[PDB]
Ligand binder design. Structure first.
Ligand SMILES: CCCCCC/C=C\CCCCCCCC(=O)O
Ligand SMILES: NCCc1c[nH]c2ccc(O)cc12
Length: 355
């Protein structure tokens, strides 16, 4: 009945570090960060959660290299996270604390993976940045709500450039981990200061992926394109493309940084979409730590449909996305048609990034 599930999950918590493209706050690079002990447990819990949600519905008798496919973006902390989530599926306690080989870490890739990061890579997609800066009117109005807090942050960390919209978002996420992990030293980030920065971050990132057709295509179009490439085979009884386990592989788990959850949510919420039968606000949909998007494919006799379930963070209840004009279980061809507008192929995306 349930035949196949895609999961994309934000990676487990890692030692607070600066983002590439972010301001220098920690003076250590997040790309060098270990998962925290909490982050390893969170990643493992996700796999235990997913097994309980889906193992028996998918007809899987044993989670192993044939039955699930753990993938991740090209960052150690995301790759470690995805493999630990796999350990949770398998119920392999000791692999949670494994020091995964460089080899086991690289073996979490798939062909379209790196293209998913093109739109935020410096110099690689200038048209995406032109189109984000074109929304400066709305950005200024949003930032006007938190500019006092940004000024206090910049007072302590002068590298934060309020003129760079991503610096406000990336400073908030950096400070959020720092407050969690070192609370004694973080008493200056009060509840009101962080909640204020969080609102700015939510509104900026949601604007950056949904305000215009070009922002939606460039940030999320390749996600749709690869998903449909896969579902065109699954819906014919064939294996997910490139899945190591072939037809045996019933679950794909993709561990990412926050920006790809945001982009994936945006790609699944064209105008008129609902989350639990209500319009969404930027603040409510902002994917926190522990967030994941679940893409469930159903088959009733010969009829395939797709259901989209979103968990916005740790301990948050799942909510179901409904596309405009479709049901919770949206028949496959209608679902794909509903999402054609902002889908884009790799060849098209490279041209659209540069033209
Ligand atoms: C979530 C959509 C992006 C919002 C605006 C970003 C603007 C310009 C791109 C530069 C920022 C680099 C992001 C790095 C994020 C990461 O690696 O986790
Ligand atoms: N090949 C499918 C890549 C991909 C795109 N979006 C996804 C969401 C979840 C997932 O497991 C995977 C994906």
């Amino acid at each position: 009945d349930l035949k196949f599930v895609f999961v994309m999950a934000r990676g487990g918590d890692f030692v607070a570090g600066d983002y590439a493209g972010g301001p220098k706050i920690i003076n250590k690079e997040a790309k060098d960060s270990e998962l925290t002990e909490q982050g390893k447990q969170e990643a493992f819990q996700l796999g235990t959660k997913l097994s309980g949600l889906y193992k028996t519905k998918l007809g899987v008798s044993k989670w192993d290299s044939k039955t699930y496919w753990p993938v991740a973006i090209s960052q150690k902390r995301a790759q470690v996270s995805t493999l630990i989530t796999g350990a949770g599926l398998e119920g392999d306690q000791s692999k949670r604390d494994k020091t995964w080989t460089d080899q086991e870490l690289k073996a979490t890739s798939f062909p379209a993976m790196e293209s998913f990061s093109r739109f935020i890579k410096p110099s690689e997609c200038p048209n995406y940045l032109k189109e984000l800066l074109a929304q400066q009117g709305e950005i200024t109005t949003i930032v006007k709500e938190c500019i006092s807090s940004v000024q206090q942050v910049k007072s302590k960390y002068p590298a934060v450039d309020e003129k760079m919209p991503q610096h406000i978002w990336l400073a908030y996420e950096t400070l959020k981990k720092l407050k969690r992990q070192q609370p004694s030293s973080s008493t200056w980030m009060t509840d009101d200061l962080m909640k204020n920065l969080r609102e700015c971050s939510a509104k900026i990132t949601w604007l950056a992926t949904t305000k215009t057709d070009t922002l939606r295509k460039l940030s999320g179009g390749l996600l749709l394109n690869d998903l449909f490439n896969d579902m065109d085979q699954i819906t014919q009884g064939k294996a997910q493309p490139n899945a190591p386990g072939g037809k045996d592989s019933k679950l794909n788990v993709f561990t990412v940084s926050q920006f790809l959850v945001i982009s994936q949510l945006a790609a699944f919420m064209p105008e008129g979409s609902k989350l639990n039968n209500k319009a969404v606000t930027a603040s409510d949909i902002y994917p926190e730590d522990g967030s994941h998007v679940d893409i469930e494919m159903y088959q009733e006799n010969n009829k395939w449909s797709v259901k989209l379930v979103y968990v916005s963070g740790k301990d948050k209840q799942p909510q179901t996305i409904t596309l405009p004009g479709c049901q919770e279980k949206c028949p496959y061809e209608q679902f794909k048609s509903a999402l054609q507008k902002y889908k884009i192929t790799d060849e098209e995306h490279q041209k659209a990034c540069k033209n």
